[PDB]
Design a protein around this ligand. Structure first.
Ligand SMILES: Nc1ncnc2c1ncn2[C@@H]1O[C@H](COP(=O)(O)OP(=O)(O)OP(=O)(O)O)[C@@H](O)[C@H]1O
Ligand SMILES: Nc1ncnc2c1ncn2[C@@H]1O[C@H](COP(=O)(O)OP(=O)(O)OP(=O)(O)O)[C@@H](O)[C@H]1O
Ligand SMILES: Cc1cn([C@H]2C[C@H](O)[C@@H](COP(=O)(O)OP(=O)(O)OP(=O)(O)O)O2)c(=O)[nH]c1=O
Ligand SMILES: [Mg+2]
Ligand SMILES: [Mg+2]
Ligand SMILES: [Mn+2]
Ligand SMILES: [Mn+2]
Ligand SMILES: [Mn+2]
Ligand SMILES: [Mn+2]
Lengths: 683, 289, 289, 683
């Protein structure tokens, strides 16, 4: 057992009835005195290091060639002047095991934290030394964290794509299904998580070229996609991850759900394909009134109306579908379906729940399309247009496939530096740069939507960490007040930066003129409701920072009207799995699952306390499972009212609560305006 | 005072080998020496034999003679685990790691191995000697069962645990740990039933029962020593395993309410490192807040 | 040809009583008449009493006399389901619907009931008559077991299925449906084991075993008709229950590889709604012609 | 039970110790006087029938519009003038259950045998009334039988494709793999059996752009193809059938074979994809000498040499592969691999065996490409060039994917009518028409190869029927002499028709100039060896027909040199599974499996005696399992010497014989020049 691992395991050993949290710090020192410095490759000067990394195909020549060597050296010096120290052993371990650049033999460390941050900053700035230094100060203060793809791969020649969330629309044809399989394989090859909408696909027992009972339904397509994702597994590094979304009014919805049951046969169950269910308000109304619902055959609806079932508003179309004899449908019990969803989420955490009307009643780009499905993490909610992939030697009709750009603000570090505006604007600029530098040659609709929509996702993390280190309970009304104010400022500065980029470049996102930003509707609740903190403690937390008022929001609305907005979407709160360790932050805006988490690496045990955990804030670091899920829903809705896309919202349940409690949480989330529900993790 | 909590513990521990994917052990298995693979196969085959008889014979026969529907339900569940779960898991391991001919050969080897035949003869003989309404014959069989659960398995368990503790064969090792977790509670439960019968006796009768238990333990122990040497000498571990089986013999005695018989020794630290939801319908009031 | 397949189907059907919340049945139970509540209680006690015999004797005795490790494991699993799952499930239903004193009285009544006793003792008599190494006596017991699993339970299952098909007592009806699904596979499996014995017999011995099976079926059937009128006349259902008994008698016969005895009848729709070549190495000179 | 069913079952009820074969005839009468005539749909005249079939989308109106109604009436009258009678109940039953056109609800019969033959002939003639009458006389005499796709689908609006088998080359890339999956689904949707060569795909543990041990090998692609064929299953009517072919020198050859082991795990086992193994002469030489062989990693060979492993001759490059340190290889025992092949074929009948050198030593188009794999029935052996399917928005390099049209000569009817020449030429014309009117819009390589190669497959059926009905034992040397003469005549007249078509159209197949037809090498054995019958009985059998001599072959060689050949490939002997029933013929050139076959249809059982089976020829209808497989190999080699493509050669084995006997049969087949071995069916 290594010395740092012993020093880390000494945390659980209680002295005077208290955990030895400070010992973790010592572990970090050991982890750097015994391992990191010994296995870190050192060079006589930075010029030699850069030459070795470029020549050995570690870095890219293009992004480094935009700067003189003096500017690169100045950026590296700015990164190293902070003298950044990892506060916990797990932060440094996760960085140097997951993100630090290693030799081809994987035994030496080529990149420190400062080196990786400097390289990512130089990639972000695209030739501006001052902008690169600003990015270096942003990331070394740990105010902003690029996502795992961006942080890991920026500036590296041997790399995947910087985007890892991809949403694909699948049209109801064999050509479109095969193209979807191909694109899923290509994007999993790039290292991205792929979500596919299967609602347009006709159900099982439908007609193919006017022969009856011929379609295999969406379950056969799910089997094909599951095989494709198993095959494309990042060159045998990570398990291929894919998601399939189906509307709850699709007839296959039960069989869809049956793919996640344990009792399902081998020809029914898909193991590497996550599933999500899109639930329109009509289904919730039918379940609430206990009226029996109807699941429709999509192809009959398409033949009758010329549009797909998921392309029209089910609230106004459901009665017409039911009363139409030419539309084929099957009787179901919506309450039984809700109970089945709750039971499946209890067993396996699936499916993801998308409340379609909750997403689309605040969607700014409904003119382009309504949000029909979400991503693999159930937080990307964007307009998508299906593509018509025709036969060979025939021109395809390329639509819009969602691929947003991830990046997370560290709420604790951002707010302690009183730099919400600067961090949000710099993160928006970096996300815009990464979106502009993304070029996928095997996903035509993804590339077209990246060029047109210019959608980015700016998330936040360390919400619970910040609240606990400031003596605020996550379920307290003060925490929701802080979340409201902080995320309203984040939205304000994100919109301001998007409008500034649109003014500078002279271009907005495609079909912006039809958006609620152009019409000013988006700013309605912002020009009438003041989002300043209602509690003195939160106001003192925001001291030293200008909180945008209704007049500021009116000025921003006028600015957007005059200049437009560069990004169709700006904010989405991703789970932030492993980057939260490196940043010493709690994951996403979720409450912490455990105060101290026990992990097993190799044959060794390691202990990670939550950041800033001590005896004084032990009570404020309440575990997520012990919390009331209604108050967690309230906080997530408070944040969601300022996020244009969704939030990865995992439910944290105890083994005692039943499926009725899960359904109640889901229905309260629907009532409170929650757009997506990610997971049902049972303790 | 205890059956209900054992019932709940047994049913909550329910598992199937298919829950554990075994293809991950393929490489660490390939990398072991021929001696190591041979000992490993034989060790698990010896375990398979013990569980076969514990499931087919031992647990069902004890269930037949023990009074009370709840006690019988626990013993029936334990019997099912022995042959439907434990014994079968070893075949899952064999079918993953070994070619059919090696599997056929090791099962032929159990039939002709004199120590394995002797221990089966002794244990099963006691099971089949139980006489209806004769609590003494039942006690003797329960002692035999505790010795199988808490002592005899351990010459076998040593090796999967020894590898697990080094980060080798960890999927197979996960199965073995689940089996071991089950046997530990099986040994305690049967031990408590044996103590019930023992506590009904005169002091003179108790003295004879202790003699029976200690004589049986020593006889099984001496045979297990020879078995251990036969299997482990080729991998250099016989002395270490012997310390482990003595450690577990003391645990078996304790499960029977008796004092430890062997002196304490340091066990290989590697081996020590080797160690639906309820549904309610939705009410109309759950849709309003 | 079949034991591993049945192993798979059995273990994948595993369930526990706790999974179904029972309390919501009180919302329909309170609305039944006295005769409906009385019939339900009596039917439930009938099923409970018969299933206990199957758990304590029927399955374990067959597991004891059948040769084959894999068959013994499947049979052990089935015995476990009777004792650990089914018995607890019946108890749970009772404790939910009736107070302790009412449960004790119903069991006293059903324990003294002539038609329940006649069939219970007929089945138990055949289990007690199995002789070591006598496959004829084993076959007769297997026939009795199949008749219990696939036929005798169904005069009882009718009522919970009847309510279940109407939207009444849905939680206990779900439990009963899971139990019934287990008994169906138990009956099919034991049926295949009986056919194996039957097929080893001479033509004269086969004809004699067929006569045994039909004679036994007739005795049980005539008692079922009386049992049925005794319980179901007070709720007006006996005619339809009789059709259900005959339909299930035919399934039991088919499980034993015999022809149906009764003409085909339609069943009550409410109840329906409830329901290796030798490897030889190349020797060279096989490449030259 | 139906009356005809009882009459057919009366065959096995022996009278005076003999089978009641004549009862079968009675059955047909019953089957027509009680079922077919009552279930047929009669119109006032042919005009109303044709109009009803055209407007109700049963028939394509284009092919019928090329004839005036008087010509169509004359063709139908020619078809009905023969007064064709089905001699056995099963012939009529199979036609009216599998090939006769029925209504949309399948309650009535719209097409008689004469109607179907007339429609197929009118489609074949393409506006020529005299040619349509010639086709009608050819098919009503049952001299020629179009394949099941062509016979069933010709002239139908709801038809699929007329091509039976498709062969795809899969290049070693994710884009090519995805395109192969798409094309396989498209062609299975069209109803054709798809064969894919997986020998170019790099093995398991190869590098995908410098990251090693990343590839899943051919087994992952096999699983993808298996799921694709499961999904595309002819709209749920016929199970999707695919074939995978791998060279025996591929490193994955064991894992490949492990896909068919009965003990294989679910993550490896493949159940709807047939497997074939391509064995060069080098492997047989290594196994014969007992020298340990080496399987190779295709990607290392491609990197070192610039060509795929299966793209070059292993007999000359195996030593270079072994001695090259930059080529990665694994040691295997070739005799153990042969024994594994024999064991697998005993257990499941797989893999198909393709003796590559036997195919390519007489292959006429080696200049275009060597034959590297076969079809799903292991009788199509043609040159194929792999396609380079590039990224989206990049032009793809379209290669040649094999596809040929099947058609079988009925040997008994052809020789009874003494019309080998006329039948062969008319069948060649019909297959040329089927190729010309075939246009597949989703398989580009298949379309290009169909347009360029112009390959057709002209098979033969009722070899054993003709031999047994003429008192010739199938294993006798007289039978092999008859096969030699008959198939030399078939080859002569097929080459003559191909050259005549090339002359009349002024065009040959692509790259004909480099073929052995152009250089005259192909005719060598035909201009030096006489293939006239050596037995007086066979010569009498061939009386009334001009058997080509060496002078006729020299004249044909000169004619080909002057005019060229229209078809790259002309003759391939398919299994002819179910269409042999309608023709009252034994399946293909294979010996009969059983004299009387008991088949269960619905709840009834029927007995089909072999065509012409009686007391006097009972022992001439020797069952295949009772026959010496060495003499069957001799027969198949004798036929194969005159067939440019392969023959679907099924091995018929007894349960008593060992895997050593199967290996001996395989090695004797390789020694005798057998190109492919189809199945190892054990009694
Ligand atoms: N907690 C830590 N986080 C990150 N790096 C660390 C940490 N502890 C030590 N290091 C690394 O080890 C070096 C030694 O740091 P130490 O605590 O011994 O003193 P120092 O005054 O920071 O040293 P130096 O002269 O290297 O700057 C640091 O410069 C840094 O590179
Ligand atoms: N074996 C058969 N094959 C094909 N069609 C048949 C067969 N048997 C009967 N039919 C059909 O059923 C009809 C019944 O007539 P059948 O053969 O009994 O003789 P028919 O009335 O004297 O006239 P004909 O033989 O001249 O058609 C035939 O005309 C024919 O259309
Ligand atoms: C992407 C991917 C490829 N492969 C295998 C199958 C293909 O035959 C083979 C080639 O993939 P390619 O698509 O050719 O990958 P590449 O072009 O980026 O890499 P290279 O330059 O080396 O050609 O890699 C996998 O096994 N799994 C995968 O996920
Ligand atoms: Mg379409
Ligand atoms: Mg490539
Ligand atoms: Mn056990
Ligand atoms: Mn045990
Ligand atoms: Mn039971
Ligand atoms: Mn039972």
């Amino acid at each position: 057992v290594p010395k740092w691992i012993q020093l880390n395991n000494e945390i659980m050993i209680q002295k005077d009835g208290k955990f030895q949290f400070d010992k973790d710090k010592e572990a970090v020192h050991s982890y750097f005195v015994d391992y990191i410095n010994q296995n870190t490759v050192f060079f006589h000067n930075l010029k030699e290091k850069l030459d070795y990394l470029v020549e050995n195909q570690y870095y890219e020549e293009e992004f480094l060639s935009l700067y003189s060597f003096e500017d690169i050296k100045e950026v590296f010096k700015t990164a190293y002047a902070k003298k950044f120290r990892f506060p916990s052993f797990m932060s440094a371990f996760k960085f140097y095991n997951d993100y630090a650049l290693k030799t081809n033999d994987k035994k030496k460390i080529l990149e420190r934290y400062e080196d990786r941050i400097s390289i990512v900053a130089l990639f972000f700035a695209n030739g501006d030394t001052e902008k690169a230094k600003e990015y270096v100060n942003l990331m070394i203060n740990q105010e902003y964290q690029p996502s795992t793809p961006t942080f890991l791969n920026a500036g590296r020649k041997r790399r995947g794509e910087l985007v890892s969330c991809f949403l694909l629309e699948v049209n109801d044809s064999l050509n479109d299904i095969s193209r979807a399989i191909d694109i899923s394989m290509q994007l999993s090859k790039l290292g991205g998580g792929v979500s596919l909408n299967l609602s347009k696909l006709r159900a099982k027992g439908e007609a193919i070229k006017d022969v009856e009972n011929a379609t295999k339904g969406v379950v056969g397509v799910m089997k094909l996609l599951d095989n494709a994702f198993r095959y494309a597994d990042q060159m045998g590094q990570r398990q291929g991850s894919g998601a399939a979304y189906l509307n709850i009014f699709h007839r296959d919805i039960n069989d869809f759900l049956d793919t996640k049951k344990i009792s399902a046969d081998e020809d029914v169950r898909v193991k590497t394909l996550s599933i999500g269910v899109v639930i329109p308000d009509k289904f919730v109304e039918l379940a609430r009134e206990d009226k029996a619902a109807y699941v429709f055959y999509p192809h009959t609806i398409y033949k009758e109306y010329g549009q797909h079932m998921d392309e029209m508003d089910m609230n106004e179309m459901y009665d017409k579908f039911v009363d139409n004899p030419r539309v084929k449908k099957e009787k179901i019990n919506p309450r039984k379906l809700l109970e089945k969803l709750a039971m499946l989420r209890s067993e396996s955490g699936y499916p993801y729940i998308m409340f379609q009307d909750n997403v689309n009643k605040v969607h700014a780009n409904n003119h382009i399309s309504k949000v029909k499905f979400s991503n693999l993490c159930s937080e990307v909610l964007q307009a998508s247009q299906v593509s018509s992939y025709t036969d060979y030697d025939e021109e395809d009709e390329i639509g819009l496939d969602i691929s947003c750009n991830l990046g997370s603000l560290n709420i604790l570090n951002v707010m302690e530096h009183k730099s919400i505006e600067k961090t949000v604007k710099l993160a928006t600029d970096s996300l815009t740069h990464v979106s502009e530098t993304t070029d996928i040659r095997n996903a035509p609709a993804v590339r077209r939507a990246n060029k047109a929509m210019k959608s980015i996702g700016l998330g936040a993390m360390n919400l619970h960490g910040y609240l606990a280190q400031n003596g605020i309970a996550y379920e307290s009304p003060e925490a929701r007040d802080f979340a409201n104010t902080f995320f309203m400022m984040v939205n304000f500065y994100s919109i301001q930066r998007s409008a500034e980029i649109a003014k500078e470049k002279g271009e907005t996102f495609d079909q912006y003129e039809g958006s609620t930003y152009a019409t000013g509707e988006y700013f309605d609740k912002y020009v009438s409701t003041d989002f300043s903190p209602k509690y003195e403690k939160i106001a003192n937390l925001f001291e030293g920072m200008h909180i945008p008022t209704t007049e500021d929001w009116k000025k921003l609305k006028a600015f957007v009207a005059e200049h437009g907005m560069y990004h169709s979407y700006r904010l989405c709160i991703a789970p932030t799995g492993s980057i939260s360790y490196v940043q010493s932050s709690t994951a996403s805006v979720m409450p912490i699952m455990e105060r101290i988490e026990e992990r097993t690496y190799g044959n060794s045990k390691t202990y990670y306390p939550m950041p800033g955990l001590a005896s004084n804030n032990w009570f404020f670091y309440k575990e997520a499972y012990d919390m009331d899920m209604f108050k967690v829903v309230d906080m997530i809705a408070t944040i969601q009212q300022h996020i244009d896309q969704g939030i990865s919202f995992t439910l944290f349940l105890k083994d005692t609560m039943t499926t009725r409690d899960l359904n109640r949480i889901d229905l309260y989330a629907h009532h409170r305006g929650i757009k997506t529900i990610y997971y049902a993790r049972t303790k | 005072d205890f059956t209900q909590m054992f019932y709940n513990q047994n049913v909550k521990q329910f598992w199937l080998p298919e829950e554990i994917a075994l293809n991950g052990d393929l490489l660490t298995w390939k990398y072991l020496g021929k001696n190591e693979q041979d000992t490993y196969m034989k060790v698990l085959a010896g375990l398979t034999l013990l569980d076969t008889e514990q499931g087919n014979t031992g647990m069902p026969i004890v269930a037949e003679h023990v009074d009370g529907h709840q006690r019988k339900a626990v013993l029936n569940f334990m019997a099912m685990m022995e042959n439907a779960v434990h014994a079968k898991s070893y075949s899952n391991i064999f079918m993953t790691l070994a070619p059919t001919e090696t599997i056929n050969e090791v099962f032929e080897w159990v039939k002709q191995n004199k120590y394995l035949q002797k221990k089966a003869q002794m244990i099963v003989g006691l099971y089949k000697a139980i006489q209806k309404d004769d609590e003494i014959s039942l006690f003797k069989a329960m002692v035999a069962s505790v010795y199988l659960e808490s002592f005899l398995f351990y010459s076998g368990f040593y090796y999967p645990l020894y590898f697990y503790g080094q980060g080798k064969l960890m999927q197979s090792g996960e199965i073995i740990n689940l089996i071991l977790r089950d046997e530990a509670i099986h040994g305690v439960y049967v031990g408590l039933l044996a103590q019930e019968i023992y506590n009904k006796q005169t002091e003179e009768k108790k003295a004879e029962l202790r003699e029976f238990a200690i004589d049986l333990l020593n006889q099984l122990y001496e045979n297990e020593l020879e078995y251990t040497e036969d299997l482990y000498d080729q991998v250099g571990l016989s002395h270490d395993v012997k310390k482990f089986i003595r450690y577990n013999a003391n645990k078996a005695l304790m499960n029977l309410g008796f004092d430890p018989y062997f002196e304490e020794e340091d066990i290989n630290p590697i081996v020590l490192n080797g160690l639906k939801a309820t549904v309610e319908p939705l009410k109309d009031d759950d849709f309003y807040f």
